[PDB]
Design a protein around this ligand. Structure first.
Ligand SMILES: Cc1cc(CNCCS(C)(=O)=O)ccc1Br
Ligand SMILES: Cc1cc(CNCCS(C)(=O)=O)ccc1Br
Ligand SMILES: [Mg+2]
Lengths: 150, 151
């Protein structure tokens, strides 16, 4: 169906962008809004309401640029805003070598049903936060399975 | 009016981005669609249909990134697409030292009523192409007045 084709196109755009950033160890923080509304967090960032593309996702997270610090929040198959604030988790069960992007991802996942993807600037490792837990060191196939399951 | 206020915000976003890129010698090519529709050229790029911000404009043109090569085309208060093709002018009144961004800007200005802004990656100089003419070495005040008059 059109809706199904659109969802797969967006998943492919996300995975292509994450692949690029993982290879270059570009830190990234990408939250996909689900049933819990995140308007309050979207409003803290720079409004985009942009079509998804791998190219735009990559350009947003280039280090030392206006849009790279903070989270991209996606909603309704669009990039709603970039450089958004997310709450930092206080969970004592996050690996202590991880920094602010990972704690922000877990934090939003504790108060919403959203799915957040994180790329580590230290290792290029890819992780996903959902329901208060962080799933670390994902392969490309694992990330795709999570996005399709979501 | 809201329309006028939105126009003022878009102009401020553009000028802030252009000033940032000029200072850092970030090459940029930004065409503002006017009454001649530019859909044929918009469709050659990556669709964004994004709200304008100085931050997004800057992020688009960072060198060596997916979106930096080609023109950004704006439709009113939106960035319609990035990395768009524009036709190259063969006008003899384009300074010989200038490269493809300036020739593309003059080229689209010959077949549309659009206004195109160019930042030179060589010098940081800012120019505008309109109606087949290239106006070089603009001050910040001159660019803002051109944009305000264009709206
Ligand atoms: C999610 C994902 C993961 C990878 C694997 N990264 C490799 C890092 S390594 C071999 O140094 O440990 C690639 C693309 C995507 Br998309
Ligand atoms: C249009 C504009 C012009 C300037 C003047 N910069 C001229 C000096 S340069 C970059 O060539 O070394 C500043 C801001 C805006 Br906005
Ligand atoms: Mg002069």
């Amino acid at each position: 169906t059109p809706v199904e084709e659109a969802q797969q196109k967006t998943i492919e755009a996300i995975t292509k962008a994450i692949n690029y950033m993982a290879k270059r160890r570009i830190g990234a923080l990408l939250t996909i809004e689900r049933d819990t509304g995140m308007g309050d967090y979207i409003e803290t960032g720079i409004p985009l309401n942009a079509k998804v593309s791998s190219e735009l996702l990559i350009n947003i997270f280039i280090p030392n640029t206006p849009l790279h610090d903070g989270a991209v929040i996606m909603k309704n198959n669009e990039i709603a805003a970039a450089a958004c604030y997310l709450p930092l988790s206080e969970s004592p069960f996050i690996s202590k070598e991880l920094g602010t992007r990972h704690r922000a991802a877990v934090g939003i996942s504790e108060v919403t049903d959203s799915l957040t993807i994180i790329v580590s600037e230290e290792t290029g490792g890819v992780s996903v936060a959902k329901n208060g837990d962080l799933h670390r060191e994902l392969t490309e196939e694992a990330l795709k399975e999570m996005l399709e399951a979501e």
